[PDB]
């Protein structure tokens, strides 16, 4: 079986690379430093749809990526979530939060209209991420 | 020695302990809603846990989320470590249904909490204990 990224996720992200299990994506909303991990298992919707090895690997990847994100952003608090009420394909949000951000202290989802990235600001972000993760 | 954060204690009912995490039911009957609270003093982020603890946390999230989906026959699980207000690391595991009060939004802060009926929550608790602890 072959894997491909859900079209809704593809539309809302910038592809920055691949880990052993997960595709690594930057969300195009610039309100927050916001990544997705998308495990490359066909038909996976819930974490428990992954096999045991893959579940363990997903935790390793959440650990690695969330630490890199906190180091780059010096954020006050990480938010990590697998929600998927609208998009079936298993994806894990990893979001850097700050007390001064647009949604604080609430969770980000649905609070603000998405902000477009400045191309230079996001490339610096992506570069910093690539160096730390890989 | 580890202790549950006062706000978590106020908002939950204690249903038992796994090797790493305390298992709690949220006092909001709008959703079948659990917390896993790793019993590591001072833990705030998942990355504050050591590698073994993070691995066991994934095992416990998987076990509890599978049991919850089996009991509730829910449409979708939502799993999240947010912690914007309460520093102590806790993982929400929530059963979502298309007919629920917040659907399709994430639940947090949407609706006023509902009080549990004492019989229905006890039955939910016993059913969980049977699945999780043999």
Count of domains in chain A? 1
B46 with B89: CB under 8 angstroms?
Answer: yes
The 10 Å Cβ neighbour count of residue B127 is 15
- Looking only at the bridges linking them, the beta strands covering B91-96 and B33-38 are antiparallel
Cβ partners under 8 Å of residue B7, min gap 6? B85, B86
What is the edge-to-edge ordering of all strands in the sheet holding A13-18?
A13-18, A22-27, A34-39, A92-97, A77-82, B76-81, B91-96, B33-38, B21-26, B12-17
Contacts of B82 in chain A (CB under 8 A): 79, 81, 107
The 10 Å Cβ neighbour count of residue A91 is 24
- Looking only at the bridges linking them, the beta strands covering B91-96 and B76-81 are antiparallel
Contacts of B60 in chain A (CB under 8 A): none
Q: Is the bond preceding B104 in cis, omega lying within 30 degrees of 0?
A: yes
Q: Which domain holds residue B120?
A: 1-134
Among A81, A88, A93, the residue to mutate for chain B (most B Cβ within 10 A): A81
A63 with B50: CB under 8 angstroms?
Answer: no
- Put simply, whether A80 touches B (Cβ < 8 Å) is yes
The DSSP line for chain B is -----HHHHHHEEEEEE-SSEEEEEES-TTS-EEEEEE--TT--SGGGS-HHHHHHHHHHHHHHHHHHHHHH--SEEEEEE--SS--S--EEEEEE-TTSTTTTS--TTTSPPPPPPHHHHHHHHHHHHHHH--
CA A112/CA A114 separation, integer angstroms: 6
CA A57/CA A1 separation, integer angstroms: 20
The three-state secondary structure class of A83 is coil
Q: What is the domain-level CATH number for residue A52? A: 3.30.428.10
Tell me how close the Cα of A66 comes to any Cα of chain B, in angstroms: 8
- Selection from B103, B105, B100, B96 nearest residue B72 by Cα: B96
């Amino acid at each position: 079986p072959a894997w491909s990224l859900h079209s809704r996720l593809k539309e809302d992200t910038i592809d920055i690379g691949d880990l052993p299990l997960s595709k690594v994506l930057v969300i195009k909303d610039a309100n927050y430093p916001w990544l997705l991990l998308v495990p490359r298992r066909p038909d996976a919707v819930e974490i428990i749809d992954l096999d045991e090895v893959q579940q363990a690997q997903l935790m390793t990847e959440i650990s690695r990526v969330s630490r890199a994100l906190k180091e780059i952003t010096k954020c006050d608090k990480l938010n990590i979530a697998a929600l998927g009420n609208l998009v079936p394909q298993l994806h894990v949000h990893i979001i850097a939060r700050r007390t001064g951000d647009a949604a604080w202290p609430r969770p980000v989802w649905g609070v603000m209209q998405p902000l477009a990235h400045d191309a230079t600001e996001v490339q610096n972000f992506i570069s910093a991420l690539r160096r730390k993760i890989w």
